Structure 1
Amino acid sequence: DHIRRPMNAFMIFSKRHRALVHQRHPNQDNRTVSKILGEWWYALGPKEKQKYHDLAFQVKEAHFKAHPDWKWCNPYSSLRRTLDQRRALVMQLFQDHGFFPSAQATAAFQARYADIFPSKVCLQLKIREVRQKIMQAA
């Protein structure tokens, strides 16, 4: 039972609305529920979204007040050309199967470009990075 990491705005939103999403989608597993929670979080307006950011701020403040000494712990030329190519392909994946493509369509996308994405975690990260970057500019 070490000192945990404080919840962000989304993890607070997930803690509250996860049981409601599972009620409205009972034949879809928890990993798919996480895809729905993220879809709802993007759908919120600045009014309701700021409510959870303000709630996440107080959690961080109380966390430092309770744990004052806690610390947050954890080809070169063709590298940028590769990264730009990876983001462009994930852009096509979203416009072809939605921003939260099914695990099947995501797996088939990985195999179609198995050379560009040498692993599943490399593709999933790029799916999350590109999607989150589009939503901040909306």
Structure 2
Amino acid sequence: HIRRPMNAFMIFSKRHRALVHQRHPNQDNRTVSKILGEWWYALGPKEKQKYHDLAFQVKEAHFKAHPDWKWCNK
């Protein structure tokens, strides 16, 4: 099963979700998601375009390690 290439904020979330959870004691993982969104807005273009470069580099190797793959929504 070929899954979609990760977004930029998806990579961000993967790298910082645990952190947000540790730094907001026993919160809900949806408030964790929200705070992750806040962190993403408050992030400087400096690293935002780094996560963007990461998303590009994952996307290329997804469009070549899987030829003829489409964004199919049922």
Place the TM-score, normalised by the shorter chain, in its bin: over 0.9
TM-score under structure 1 normalisation? 0.52
Q: What percentage of aligned pairs have identical amino acids?
A: 100
Please give the root-mean-square deviation of Cα atoms over the aligned residues, in Å: 0.6
Deviation at 1:5, TM superposition (A): 0.3
CA radius of gyration, larger in: 1
Q: Secondary structure at the match of 2:64?
A: helix
Q: Deviations over 1:63-119 (max 9, x none)?
A: 001111111110xxxxxxxxxxxxxxxxxxxxxxxxxxxxxxxxxxxxxxxxxxxxx
Per the alignment, residue 28 of structure 1 pairs with 27
Unaligned runs of 5+ in 1: 75-138
Moved over 6 A (4+): none
Equivalenced residues, count: 73
User: If each structure's helix is expressed as a fraction of its own residues, which one has the higher value?
Assistant: 1
TM-score under structure 2 normalisation? 0.95
Q: Distance in 1 between matches of 2:37 and 2:54?
A: 18
Unaligned runs of 5+ in 2: none
- Relative contact order, CA 8 A, sep 6+: which one is greater? 2
Q: Distance in 1 between matches of 2:9 and 2:52?
A: 8
Per the alignment, residue 43 of structure 1 pairs with 42
